[PDB]
């Protein structure tokens, strides 16, 4: 029932290989729905989910304009930040930005976000109160005083409490059949021996949406967190995700081990054993 909209900006300079690239993508929960790449033939906000296609020309024109303005502003900002750190003109650098809103099941704002990084290091973030900034160093303090002068925090609060929540509610309705449908994982347990005395038990989860899931192994009903290999959750390419947890067990002791699965699409949480 809880939901989020996030936009992600990446601005990467490439000295000697043209002007910095600006890329903007939008997600609702784990579903991408829009993209903008300043390297494209015709740079425009483009759809990436069917339920956004129905928006009208004003929408696509406005979002493209914001993104084309952002392209030039992020180029100015990469040069500024290069100055703030006394960096030469030869290296490549990256600004990343993430902002958006979380809403609860009723659709009321839980909290807003706006955070920036430079070359992968935290740089400046809007505080949870949507009205003050946390700067990471004396360079980001310059950005902070520019943003205080620009009433950036105030404009973002208005957006995060207004347009962000309102459009998210609109998107969750227009795409309810997918955005509001949780697909349970298909599960099974496998057994690969490693030696005469030990075997690998692997618990599999496939075809689930959204990506949030809990997979755990237990031994005599007690968690094996230290000993579980948890692969990172991975996209299948069809909107769904995949994951597995693996534990190495003594031969013969397999039945003291249960795999536990929690996912929003599941009627009940699952308990699984190896079934030879």
């Amino acid at each position: 029932g809880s939901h989020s909209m996030r936009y992600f900006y990446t601005a990467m300079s490439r000295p000697g290989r043209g002007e910095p690239r600006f890329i903007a993508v939008g997600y609702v929960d784990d579903t991408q729905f829009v993209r903008f790449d300043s390297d494209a033939a015709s740079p425009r906000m483009a759809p990436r989910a069917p339920w956004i296609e129905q928006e009208g020309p004003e929408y696509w024109d406005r979002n493209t304009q914001i993104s084309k303005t952002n392209t030039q502003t992020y180029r100015e900002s990469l040069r500024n930040l290069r100055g703030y750190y006394n960096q030469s003109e030869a290296g490549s650098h990256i600004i990343q930005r993430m902002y958006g809103c979380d809403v609860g099941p009723d659709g009321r704002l839980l909290r807003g976000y706006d955070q920036s990084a430079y070359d992968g290091k935290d740089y400046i973030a809007l505080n949870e109160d949507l009205s003050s900034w946390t700067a990471a160093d004396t360079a980001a303090q310059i950005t902070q005083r520019k943003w205080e002068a620009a009433r950036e925090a105030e404009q973002l609060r208005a957006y995060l409490e207004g347009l962000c929540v309102e459009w998210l509610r609109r998107y969750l309705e227009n795409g309810k059949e997918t955005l509001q449908r949780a697909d349970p994982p298909k599960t099974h347990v496998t057994h690969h021996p490693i030696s005469d005395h030990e075997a690998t038990l692997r618990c599999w989860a496939l075809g689930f949406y959204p990506a949030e899931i809990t997979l755990t192994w237990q031994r005599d009903g007690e968690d094996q967190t230290q000993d579980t290999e948890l692969v990172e959750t991975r996209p299948a390419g069809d909107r769904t995700f995949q994951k597995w947890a693996a534990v190495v067990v003594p031969s013969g002791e397999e039945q003291r081990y249960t795999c536990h699965v929690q996912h929003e699409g599941l009627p009940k949480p699952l308990t699984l054993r190896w079934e030879p």
Partner: peptide, 9 residues
């Protein structure tokens, strides 16, 4: 919908 273009860093 995107937020409006913010100020340069």
């Amino acid at each position: 919908h995107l937020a409006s273009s913010g100020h340069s860093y």
